Design a protein around this motif. Structure first.
Motif, PDB file in Angstrom:
ATOM      1  N   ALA A  92       0.804  -1.212   0.000  1.00 40.11           N
ATOM      2  CA  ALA A  92       0.000   0.000   0.000  1.00 40.11           C
ATOM      3  C   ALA A  92       0.841   1.269   0.000  1.00 40.11           C
ATOM      4  O   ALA A  92       0.441   2.264  -0.613  1.00 40.11           O
ATOM      5  N   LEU A  93       1.976   1.258   0.693  1.00 39.15           N
ATOM      6  CA  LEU A  93       2.777   2.461   0.897  1.00 39.15           C
ATOM      7  C   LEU A  93       4.253   2.110   0.957  1.00 39.15           C
ATOM      8  O   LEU A  93       4.656   1.305   1.799  1.00 39.15           O
ATOM      9  N   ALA A 128       3.088  13.800   5.322  1.00 39.55           N
ATOM     10  CA  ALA A 128       2.965  13.769   6.774  1.00 39.55           C
ATOM     11  C   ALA A 128       1.492  13.855   7.174  1.00 39.55           C
ATOM     12  O   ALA A 128       0.909  12.882   7.675  1.00 39.55           O
ATOM     13  N   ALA A 129       0.893  15.030   6.963  1.00 37.74           N
ATOM     14  CA  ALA A 129      -0.561  15.123   7.031  1.00 37.74           C
ATOM     15  C   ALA A 129      -1.202  14.200   6.003  1.00 37.74           C
ATOM     16  O   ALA A 129      -2.164  13.482   6.315  1.00 37.74           O
ATOM     17  N   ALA A 130      -0.648  14.180   4.783  1.00 36.43           N
ATOM     18  CA  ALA A 130      -1.139  13.287   3.734  1.00 36.43           C
ATOM     19  C   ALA A 130      -1.018  11.822   4.140  1.00 36.43           C
ATOM     20  O   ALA A 130      -1.988  11.060   4.035  1.00 36.43           O
ATOM     21  N   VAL A 131       0.167  11.411   4.613  1.00 35.32           N
ATOM     22  CA  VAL A 131       0.383  10.018   5.011  1.00 35.32           C
ATOM     23  C   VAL A 131      -0.621   9.611   6.077  1.00 35.32           C
ATOM     24  O   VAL A 131      -1.175   8.508   6.047  1.00 35.32           O
ATOM     25  N   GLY A 132      -0.868  10.494   7.039  1.00 33.97           N
ATOM     26  CA  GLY A 132      -1.876  10.196   8.041  1.00 33.97           C
ATOM     27  C   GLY A 132      -3.248   9.931   7.447  1.00 33.97           C
ATOM     28  O   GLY A 132      -3.914   8.961   7.813  1.00 33.97           O
ATOM     29  N   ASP A 172       7.023   1.894  12.563  1.00 29.90           N
ATOM     30  CA  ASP A 172       7.473   2.934  13.473  1.00 29.90           C
ATOM     31  C   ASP A 172       7.841   4.219  12.732  1.00 29.90           C
ATOM     32  O   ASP A 172       7.901   5.279  13.353  1.00 29.90           O
ATOM     33  N   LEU A 173       8.033   4.173  11.405  1.00 33.93           N
ATOM     34  CA  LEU A 173       8.256   5.381  10.618  1.00 33.93           C
ATOM     35  C   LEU A 173       7.000   6.211  10.367  1.00 33.93           C
ATOM     36  O   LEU A 173       7.118   7.339   9.871  1.00 33.93           O
ATOM     37  N   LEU A 174       5.806   5.682  10.641  1.00 31.79           N
ATOM     38  CA  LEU A 174       4.565   6.386  10.344  1.00 31.79           C
ATOM     39  C   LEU A 174       4.142   7.274  11.508  1.00 31.79           C
ATOM     40  O   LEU A 174       4.568   7.056  12.646  1.00 31.79           O
ATOM     41  N   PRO A 175       3.269   8.254  11.251  1.00 34.79           N
ATOM     42  CA  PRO A 175       2.689   9.032  12.360  1.00 34.79           C
ATOM     43  C   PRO A 175       1.939   8.117  13.306  1.00 34.79           C
ATOM     44  O   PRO A 175       1.244   7.191  12.889  1.00 34.79           O
ATOM     45  N   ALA A 176       2.076   8.403  14.599  1.00 38.03           N
ATOM     46  CA  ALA A 176       1.754   7.410  15.614  1.00 38.03           C
ATOM     47  C   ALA A 176       0.251   7.160  15.730  1.00 38.03           C
ATOM     48  O   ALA A 176      -0.164   6.017  15.913  1.00 38.03           O
ATOM     49  N   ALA A 177      -0.586   8.216  15.685  1.00 37.67           N
ATOM     50  CA  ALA A 177      -2.017   7.981  15.880  1.00 37.67           C
ATOM     51  C   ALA A 177      -2.630   7.251  14.691  1.00 37.67           C
ATOM     52  O   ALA A 177      -3.297   6.223  14.906  1.00 37.67           O
ATOM     53  N   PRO A 178      -2.421   7.673  13.437  1.00 35.44           N
ATOM     54  CA  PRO A 178      -2.945   6.867  12.313  1.00 35.44           C
ATOM     55  C   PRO A 178      -2.377   5.462  12.283  1.00 35.44           C
ATOM     56  O   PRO A 178      -3.091   4.510  11.942  1.00 35.44           O
ATOM     57  N   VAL A 225       3.145  -1.316   4.611  1.00 31.60           N
ATOM     58  CA  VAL A 225       3.154   0.135   4.729  1.00 31.60           C
ATOM     59  C   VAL A 225       4.528   0.564   5.237  1.00 31.60           C
ATOM     60  O   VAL A 225       5.105  -0.079   6.120  1.00 31.60           O
ATOM     61  N   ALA A 226       5.052   1.649   4.676  1.00 33.14           N
ATOM     62  CA  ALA A 226       6.439   2.051   4.927  1.00 33.14           C
ATOM     63  C   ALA A 226       7.403   0.884   4.714  1.00 33.14           C
ATOM     64  O   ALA A 226       8.349   0.675   5.478  1.00 33.14           O
ATOM     65  N   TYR A 227       7.141   0.083   3.678  1.00 34.06           N
ATOM     66  CA  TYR A 227       7.958  -1.084   3.363  1.00 34.06           C
ATOM     67  C   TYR A 227       8.971  -0.735   2.286  1.00 34.06           C
ATOM     68  O   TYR A 227       8.679   0.055   1.393  1.00 34.06           O
ATOM     69  N   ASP A 228      10.156  -1.332   2.392  1.00 34.47           N
ATOM     70  CA  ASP A 228      11.227  -1.219   1.410  1.00 34.47           C
ATOM     71  C   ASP A 228      11.979  -2.544   1.342  1.00 34.47           C
ATOM     72  O   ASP A 228      12.340  -3.096   2.384  1.00 34.47           O
ATOM     73  N   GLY A 229      12.224  -3.043   0.126  1.00 41.10           N
ATOM     74  CA  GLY A 229      12.880  -4.338  -0.004  1.00 41.10           C
ATOM     75  C   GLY A 229      14.332  -4.346   0.440  1.00 41.10           C
ATOM     76  O   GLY A 229      14.811  -5.331   1.007  1.00 41.10           O
ATOM     77  N   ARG A 230      15.068  -3.277   0.153  1.00 47.39           N
ATOM     78  CA  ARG A 230      16.450  -3.244   0.611  1.00 47.39           C
ATOM     79  C   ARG A 230      16.517  -3.140   2.132  1.00 47.39           C
ATOM     80  O   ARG A 230      17.386  -3.759   2.760  1.00 47.39           O
TER      81      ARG A 230
END
Lengths: 214, 214
Positions: free
Chosen positions: B58-59, B66-70, B98-104, B127-132
């Motif tokens: 998804a992400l 930041a506001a958008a990611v939430g 843990d890289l995402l805004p905490a409440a969302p 979400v906030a995933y990266d293969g490397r």
């Protein structure tokens, strides 16, 4: 020099030699001899386009499953002789070459080693290569050195290879099969129907045009 | 139960929400709300086919830039509520949450956590995933444990995910972008032209038929 719009590094998975041999009634060695002639075609077409890094996957570790592997390595070494004589390509080997039979491996190494002054191109030839083994080698490398993503990259068995911009796989197989997992992460992926010994200039053109059109 | 011939694990890269939003005049949050409805469609079609492991990307971490990611995380959590209420899917999160805004992030975790008894399906949401970063986590994991390819696999951040049989990426992008590099090494790769919020049952059917025909 490079043409803006072209891929800087093209990786080709040389798939289809076994199917080509069966369809033409030939030996496997004869298909790899023809496949080596197609590698010579490929690097010629790349030089016309200013593409100076080319990696070809000739042999997987999984497909090491002895006499055949030797003949295939030797047909590949012989079929690269024209590329070597051209002086236009520094040929380098990648993969776990210690897994191959020693005399054919030395003859392939001997062809590559004679091209150390080749310029401006680099041609990486992957034999007995596996992507999960490549990644696992980055672990063994960091261990022996005594962690960032850039530190994993630096210790890949293929750390001398930069990012791949365009991957071409022949034979209609729509899979990467673990080809350079790190460097191909953001590569454009192109699938060519033709079997590798029949790879044509039209196939090359369609692949390059697909990259330029992305 | 599973149908022989179908993929056991389907991974879908949910690409095209930004382009869809621009083309329809909508907000990004509105595209991710529609995209979540397409995830609900996807898992319904998979259950009809007996496909019980589904991973959706998804992400990316790169697209945390930041506001958008939430708002996007919250539209995703809300849009998964029907899947959760169905009881047919255990939803699990992957990625560096843990890289995402905490409440969302907590609200998305809260939806997933309520599905721990969901059965027979597993729906992994990246979400906030990266293969490397996934691969790099296998190094940090082995370090803290005190080396075979199977040991690298066991310490992937995504070690709970098995091999992917079929990857679908929408939006016409012919790239994996580092999606599960270890588990997709031998996956069939299918590229769907449609943007993710418009993903259709025809698109799903074409993808499955391409896998079955390989």
């Amino acid at each position: 020099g490079a043409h803006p719009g072209n891929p800087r590094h093209v990786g080709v998975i040389l798939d289809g030699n076994r199917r080509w041999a069966e369809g033409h009634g030939t030996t496997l060695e004869a298909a790899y001899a023809r496949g080596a002639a197609r590698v010579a075609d490929l690097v010629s077409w790349c030089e016309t386009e200013g593409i100076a890094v080319v990696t070809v996957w000739a042999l997987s570790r999984d497909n090491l499953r002895a006499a055949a592997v030797g003949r295939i390595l030797d047909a590949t070494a012989v079929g690269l002789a024209g590329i070597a004589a051209s002086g236009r390509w520094h040929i380098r080997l990648i993969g776990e070459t210690d897994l191959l039979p020693a005399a054919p491996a030395r003859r392939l190494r001997s062809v590559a080693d004679r091209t150390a002054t080749g310029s401006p191109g680099t041609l990486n030839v992957a034999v007995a290569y596996d992507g999960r083994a490549d990644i696992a080698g980055a672990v063994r490398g960091l261990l022996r050195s005594g962690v960032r993503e850039s530190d994993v990259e630096r210790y890949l068995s293929t750390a001398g290879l930069p990012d791949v911009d365009l991957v071409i796989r022949t034979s209609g197989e729509r899979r990467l099969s673990g080809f350079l997992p790190w460097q191909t992460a953001y590569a454009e992926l192109h699938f060519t129907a033709a079997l590798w010994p029949a790879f044509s200039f039209d196939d090359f053109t369609v692949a390059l045009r697909s990259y330029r059109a992305r």
